[PDB]
Design a protein around this ligand. Structure first.
Ligand SMILES: Nc1ncnc2c1ncn2[C@@H]1O[C@H](CSCC[C@H](N)C(=O)O)[C@@H](O)[C@H]1O
Ligand SMILES: N[C@@H]1[C@@H]2CC[C@H]1c1cccc(C(F)(F)F)c12
Length: 259
């Protein structure tokens, strides 16, 4: 897998998944609004809080932290690929050619319903993200020996990482076990992923994915020592079915480590 991800094209990935039609946030019934809604509602309970937060396998995207950022002053983003960390860098620093997340920022504010403008939202995220670190979920210490990341983190977020980097269910489990070591007992995990997906494209790259189900995902969380607080499923409409992948649905999990 690590070899496959070496042809991964960030801009082709952003294009396939975060631009229209999937990047069209105008329809409430799309996968974008659904993801933002899950994240916004969860943080809106006020039960997920702290000082440090780590986003696992960020890739070139930031949407997964728009709702999160107002609850954690220290945010660490991560990814296996230098090209992704670079892409993240262009947006954090407002550099030339950065990807435009404004629609997602706008929708987050919309959905959070606190009358916040999207510039203040993006400003808070940029400010609270302290670092972008290399990571490998396959290592027992996914970050490494001495990472500048405050550990253990008060909360974890990861979207479309585990299943996308694991050849099978048992790898998925280990990878979960690994990243779980980074989470303080009682802390929270917000996990988003693909359901029953085997592949997706990212330019010239063809990534293999392990097809998992809601039940497999739940059972895996329990095994890692989590209490499943919430687990929802989004079924992928035909209109969002292109040739870029074969995802059947998307899951959202809010798990609390029972340490
Ligand atoms: N061994 C590994 N450990 C952690 N991340 C890995 C990894 N191997 C590949 N990845 C990364 O996993 C990411 C999956 S794509 C997910 C991007 C983003 N989180 C989203 O919500 O869209 C890729 O960026 C890929 O580089
Ligand atoms: N592997 C996942 C799939 C396919 C590319 C990655 C991604 C990013 C955002 C939404 C979705 C999808 F298809 F689940 F909606 C995906």
């Amino acid at each position: 897998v690590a070899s496959a991800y070496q042809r991964f094209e960030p801009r082709a990935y952003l294009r396939n998944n975060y631009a229209p039609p999937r990047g069209d946030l105008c329809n409430p019934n799309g996968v974008g609004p659904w993801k933002l809604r899950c994240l916004a509602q969860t943080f809106a309970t006020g039960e997920v809080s702290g000082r440090t937060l780590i986003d696992i396998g960020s890739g070139p995207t930031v949407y997964q932290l728009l709702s999160a950022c107002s609850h954690f002053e220290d945010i660490t983003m991560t990814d296996f690929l230098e090209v992704n960390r670079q892409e993240l860098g262009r947006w954090l620093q407002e550099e030339p050619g950065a990807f435009n997340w404004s629609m997602y920022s706008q929708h987050a504010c919309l959905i959070e319903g606190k009358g916040e403008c999207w510039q203040d939202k993006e400003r808070q995220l940029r400010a609270r993200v302290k670092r972008v670190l290399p990571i490998d979920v396959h290592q027992p210490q996914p970050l490494g020996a001495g990472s500048p990341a405050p550990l253990p983190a008060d909360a974890l977020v990861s979207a479309f990482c585990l299943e996308a980097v694991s050849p099978d269910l048992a790898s998925f489990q280990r990878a979960l076990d690994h990243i779980t070591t980074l989470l303080r007992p009682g802390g929270h995990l917000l996990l988003i992923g693909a359901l029953e997906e085997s592949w997706y494209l990212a330019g010239e790259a063809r990534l293999t994915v392990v097809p998992v189900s809601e039940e497999e995902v739940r059972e895996a969380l329990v095994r890692s020592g989590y209490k499943v607080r919430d687990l929802r499923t989004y079924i992928m409409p035909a209109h969002l079915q292109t040739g870029v992948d074969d995802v059947k649905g998307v899951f959202f999990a809010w798990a609390q480590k029972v340490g």
